[PDB]
Amino acid sequence: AGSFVEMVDNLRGKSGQGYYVEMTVGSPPQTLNILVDTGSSNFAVGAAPHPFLHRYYQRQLSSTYRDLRKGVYVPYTQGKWEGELGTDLVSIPHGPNVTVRANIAAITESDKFFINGSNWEGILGLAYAEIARPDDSLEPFFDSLVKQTHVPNLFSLQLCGAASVGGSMIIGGIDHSLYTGSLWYTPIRREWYYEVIIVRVEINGQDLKMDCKEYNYDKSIVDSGTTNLRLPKKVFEAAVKSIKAASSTEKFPDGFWLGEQLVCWQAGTTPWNIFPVISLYLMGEVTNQSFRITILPQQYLRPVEDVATDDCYKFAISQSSTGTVMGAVIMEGFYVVFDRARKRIGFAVSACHVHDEFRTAAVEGPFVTDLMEDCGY
Numbered sequence: 001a002g003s004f005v006e007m008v009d010n011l012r013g014k015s016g017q018g019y020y021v022e023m024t025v026g027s028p029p030q031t032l033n034i035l036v037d038t039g040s041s042n043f044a045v046g047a048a049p050h051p052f053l054h055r056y057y058q059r060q061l062s063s064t065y066r067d068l069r070k071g072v073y074v075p076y077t078q079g080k081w082e083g084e085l086g087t088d089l090v091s092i093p094h095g096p097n098v099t100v101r102a103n104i105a106a107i108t109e110s111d112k113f114f115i116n117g118s119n120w121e122g123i124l125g126l127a128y129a130e131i132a133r134p135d136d137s138l139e140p141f142f143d144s145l146v147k148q149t150h151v152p153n154l155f156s157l158q159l160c161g162a163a164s165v166g167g168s169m170i171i172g173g174i175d176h177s178l179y180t181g182s183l184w185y186t187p188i189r190r191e192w193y194y195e196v197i198i199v200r201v202e203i204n205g206q207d208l209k210m211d212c213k214e215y216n217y218d219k220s221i222v223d224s225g226t227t228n229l230r231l232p233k234k235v236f237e238a239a240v241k242s243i244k245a246a247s248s249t250e251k252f253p254d255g256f257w258l259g260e261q262l263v264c265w266q267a268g269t270t271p272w273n274i275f276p277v278i279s280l281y282l283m284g285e286v287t288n289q290s291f292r293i294t295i296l297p298q299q300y301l302r303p304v305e306d307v308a309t310d311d312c313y314k315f316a317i318s319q320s321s322t323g324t325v326m327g328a329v330i331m332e333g334f335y336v337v338f339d340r341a342r343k344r345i346g347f348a349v350s351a352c353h354v355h356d357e358f359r360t361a362a363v364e365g366p367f368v369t370d371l372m373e374d375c376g377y
């Protein structure tokens, strides 16, 4: 600077293509698969017959559709989308037994937005109004949901990974069968993205010893719509140097660490044990108190099953000029509670995370960490 035990297993997807939930829009209801995205704030759905789409929102068939007479052009890093703003009745079949009138951006043109071969047709932006397009007056879906119903102002995500991937989005609550041990909370620094503060970073218990502002330059966010653990350039360089040193029993090309090439091992091998564990200490709920979340190589070394030329992997930790992004590689190790009502995010060891006989993902605390307020950019 529609009970919780009907919401378990309501998410699906394919490797690297994100997680989606089934939703219905309009009257009579039109079924659509929608990407769950904690890194954005618009409910944007394909509304034209793009050849890649299995289905799309047909506004002419909805008696409850209302036109907002406003368009939006949304450029981003990787592509763009253009939409026509409107409102309609929205429901989540494997969610709460409610129907809400929400803002919907009917996508009429796009570039590198929809994925060739994916099974989703829209995006559910679960973040705050501050980052909604075109401005903060366009109420996000979750804000409409809580304002129009008795649904508690909270949601939780268990992203399991694996190929078909699966998980759970518990809307309005927490399902205690989705995690082991205790939930540990980090404050939401500002209600725009789900912004958090990282106070310390360790590779196999070894501190990176950097000025903690570097870990949050210019922000640190929790984003279900991003695959990688993205780190600020300076942090990435120190983390890679430490990971290289920890795994020095086997040498890999420079391109592997930069995500420019895959590394392959025999059909049943993979030396998980040579790769270090990665710990992120998050600001706690109390003055000078923190906790740490720990991920395994099973989270940050992603298998690539698309290879047509051996078991090949992609290093899923990458450099970022937009700050730290705690994507799927972080989230797949944990049960994540987006406690909007208390402006905090809870982490707990996921009951579905991929691990081995020697190591497990961990959420531990409390730790004493001084000057935590100084870590925020």
Ligand SMILES: CO[C@H]1CC[C@@]2(Cc3ccc(-c4cncnc4)cc3[C@@]23COC(N)=N3)C[C@@H]1C
Binding pocket: 016, 017, 018, 019, 035, 037, 038, 039, 040, 041, 042, 074, 075, 076, 113, 123, 125, 133, 223, 224, 225, 226, 227
């Ligand atoms: C309001 O407009 C938002 C809409 C949302 C994206 C666009 C997008 C498309 C696909 C996926 C995508 C692909 N594969 C897998 N997962 C997600 C992600 C995004 C974004 C970028 O980053 C995050 N968080 N969301 C950013 C954009 C500014």
